[PDB]
DNA sequence: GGTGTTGTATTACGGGCTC
DNA sequence: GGTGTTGTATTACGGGCTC
DNA sequence: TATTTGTTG
DNA sequence: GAGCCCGTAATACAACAAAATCCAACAAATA
């Protein structure tokens, strides 16, 4: 009741293991490998292979005929003879000391790859998917802009937001000015103080979060109306704003050293940390981010041994061309920050390259107890190509919330593969309703669910309506959906 | 109100300063650090100091004398002209294109290592602060064992809700303790499968209250079992068991991904699976680290013999001894190989008897204590004991605190100045 | 179009001395 | 006494060929 | 028109 | 040097790091 049991006179190792008995060449359709494989082994001395009366194999190690490869991986890596779908290290450990395989280590990957369950139950490291492409470098005074909120701070006037920075990514100047949650939701007060902050120049370019309040449709269309961008994020990837949340990062230790009295009163240190912060230097361009705008310096002159340049608090007709000057050594301290980014992190990232049509994971940000269930989701179809780390793709029907998915969340599938075939009549989605997988849930718009099915194309579901739901057994259903 | 008006005829630049005036040469106590500079000044050449109407300075930028060293980098490190308690560099970059200082960056550092506040706020990685230094390997087998478990599951019918592990140290042999998140009847069921083959000599596992439980350690004492107890919110001593329930949870995972709510009928075969898979640290299954019996034996492995124990009878105590040896040698390869991946930026800590040091807000707090934006100002507190190379104990200034032991990962030595 | 980014101890590389 | 530790794609190093 | 219910900093 | 096949076999890199509630707030779905 094992394998080897039956013969195989036409496969790849014929011409191997004719080179003792030279009995039949019965090649088959594309098995002229196996002769120039024989012509390789004849070139080279490798000729190691024990042949005892059909017990053919390695000087230890069983080979396999390239008929019952699937048979040998399948029994080492399933659970028929307690695998247990591990990585390929253990698949070779596994078969290694037992079975030969000419290029083992690459069909036991290919074989990882083209599982059905096993690049969806396990992770390799998905944050370094994609190079770390930096977005455009500057534009003149901070038409370029990032914000982005973060939440936690302790109440003192019910403020616990207070954390609306805003950071004018040419000069880093950096604003923040205190809020809370209930004042606005971007409908009345919100866009106020945005205009105060904008005040000082409108920008052109925004590059925030997924946020709600920033999602709304009022928000996106007033923007619109200012001609400026939104370029949102990318369901939880807060890299997207990453200037924004780094100063935050510069902000938190700030807010802790200015933050003794912590509940009593300490509103009036959100402008100290900003004028603290603004006139430090900062390290990716040499000069502090209060200087670069500006110009000058803040008062109590404490001037550099550079030039009075810092100084410049005089006649404002050759403004123009001395701040064009600083605005160039910024611009190629920019290119450097650029470079400097790309250099030690690309080290050990991947670029992943899908072209649209073929499937893929997101293996997260799917379904908002996910522990010991099915987190990770099924494939779907890639509809817009954004970026090379930016894929929009269909993970439901039409139901909401932002169909892009960054490349950190995103996986390949591969589904190299009896399988059986696409149901398209009417009376084939009643009887073959019990060969389902897996399930995404219900449609928001009608009735109609979609589930994933056995031994058939993956992203390409079935609608199965409530005429054919009840009467298979939906007990174990909702249970992955729960 | 601006500062250098003042003459200072008695500081160390004053043997650097007459290289052009030769009159007077005041000096004070320790001031001999002033004749060996002046001596290498002279037998160098790198005159660049510009003396002015009383302002003596560098080739741009202005010396300034140690008696007012502090208050300029106090003045350029708080918020008194708008500093902000940064680190050495923008430090420098506020200094350094104003003010020379021979030896500046050292100074600063000192700064920042005296600053009270910069050492209390900031982190700098908290998380490299004392070496590997690892278990010690192993004894004869199942002597010891790595206790914990993952406090919630999605839960089953009523009777199930969470999974314990039971790994030895030395063979890593995969258990199925499916508890109910537990009463004082742990011992029970901990009794129940560890018993199953025997009593070990020290358990590895962290302060849990099933397990810190002045009941079941009475137990322990009595019995003859030692407790290593890994420190509040440090569970890396674990290990063992924590890397188990990481396999587990992808073992878990593949058995339960459609089949949520039942899987204690797949846990004994998660933990077979487990153990029929040969690991990496000691290459073989933790079938064959213990009594090398693996009863399904789908093919034989390389380099094929008899591979059968079962017809061995009395024979095993050399088997036994060439397995614990291999897999000793195997563990300490493990164990030099960690340690070498491992300290290549792991900066050591060794004090072991009084100092003042720091827990920065972490297993001092309650773990269930929000972190927030909330200053972190812990207190200095006090070291008495040096319990271990990788931790030391405290005097915890509150009721009890429940636990004194904190792993280096939280310490942050505290240093004072005059 | 839309997708990281600086603060920080820490450490590496040139003038000037001994050769 | 008491304090990390393996799974995993990924990549580096010897026999055998061309030299 | 109030009470829901998907998803997301 | 110079590269290539192939077959093992080391190799840093990240996951176990308690679990799961909402908070505030956009917009879909009925009745």
């Given at each position: 009741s094992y394998y080897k049991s039956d013969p195989l006179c036409?496969?790849?190792l014929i011409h191997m293991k004719e080179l003792?008995?030279?009995?039949?060449?019965?090649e088959d359709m594309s098995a002229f490998r196996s002769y120039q494989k024989k012509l390789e082994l004849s070139e080279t001395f490798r000729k190691n292979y024990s042949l005892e009366d059909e017990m053919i194999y390695y000087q230890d190690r069983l080979v396999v005929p390239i008929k019952q490869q699937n048979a040998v991986m399948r029994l080492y890596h399933?659970?028929?003879?307690?695998?247990?779908?591990?990585?390929v290290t253990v698949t070779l450990a596994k078969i290694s000391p037992i079975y030969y395989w000419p290029k083992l280590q690459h069909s036991i990957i290919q074989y990882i790859r083209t599982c059905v369950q096993c690049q969806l139950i396990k992770s390799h490291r998905?944050?370094?998917?994609?190079?770390?492409q930096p977005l455009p470098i500057a534009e003149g005074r901070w038409l370029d802009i990032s914000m982005d909120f973060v939440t936690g701070l302790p109440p003192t006037?019910?403020?616990?937001?207070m954390i609306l920075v805003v950071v004018?990514?040419?000069?880093?100047?950096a604003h923040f000015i205190a809020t809370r949650?209930?004042?606005?939701?971007?409908?009345?007060?919100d866009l106020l103080f945005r205009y105060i902050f904008s005040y000082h120049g409108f920008p052109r370019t925004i590059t925030s979060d997924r946020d709600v309040r920033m999602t709304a449709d009022k928000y996106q269309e007033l923007t619109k109306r200012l001609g400026i961008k939104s370029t949102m994020s990318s369901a939880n990837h807060p890299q997207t704003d990453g200037q924004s949340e780094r100063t935050i990062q510069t902000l938190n230790r700030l807010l802790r050293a200015y933050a003794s009295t912590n509940i009593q009163?300490?509103?009036?240190?959100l402008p100290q940390i900003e004028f603290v912060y603004n006139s430090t230097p900062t390290r990716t361009?040499?000069?502090?981010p209060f200087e670069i705008d500006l110009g000058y310096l803040p008062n109590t002159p404490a001037i550099?041994?550079?030039?009075?340049?810092?100084?410049?608090?005089?006649?404002?007709?050759?403004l123009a061309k001395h701040l064009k000057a600083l605005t160039i050594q910024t611009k190629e301290q920019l290119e450097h920050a650029q470079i400097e980014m790309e250099t030690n992190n690309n080290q050990r990232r991947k670029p992943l390259l899908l072209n649209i049509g073929d499937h893929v994971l997101?293996?997260?940000?799917?379904?908002f107890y996910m522990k010991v269930q099915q987190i990770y989701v099924g494939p779907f179809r890639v509809v817009?190509?954004?970026?090379?780390?930016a894929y929009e793709l269909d993970?439901?029907?039409?139901?909401?919330?932002?169909r892009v998915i960054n490349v950190q969340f995103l996986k390949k599938f591969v589904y190299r593969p009896y399988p059986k075939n696409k149901p398209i009549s009417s009376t084939e989605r009643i009887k073959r309703a019990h060969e389902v997988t897996a399930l995404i849930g219900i449609d928001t718009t009608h009735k109609t669910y979609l589930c994933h099915m056995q031994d058939?194309?993956?992203?390409?579901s079935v609608e199965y309506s409530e005429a054919e739901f009840?009467?298979?057994?939906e007990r174990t259903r909702r249970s992955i959906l729960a």
């Open positions: 036409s496969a790849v003792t008995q030279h009995n039949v060449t019965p399933d659970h028929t003879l307690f695998g247990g779908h591990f990585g998905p944050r370094l998917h994609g190079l770390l006037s019910n403020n616990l937001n004018d990514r040419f000069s880093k100047r949650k209930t004042l606005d939701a971007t409908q009345l007060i009163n300490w509103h009036v240190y361009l040499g000069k502090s550099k041994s550079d030039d009075e340049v810092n100084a410049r608090s005089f006649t404002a007709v050759e997101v293996h997260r940000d799917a379904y817009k190509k954004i970026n090379d780390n993970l439901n029907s039409h139901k909401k919330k932002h058939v194309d993956p992203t390409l009840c009467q298979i057994p």
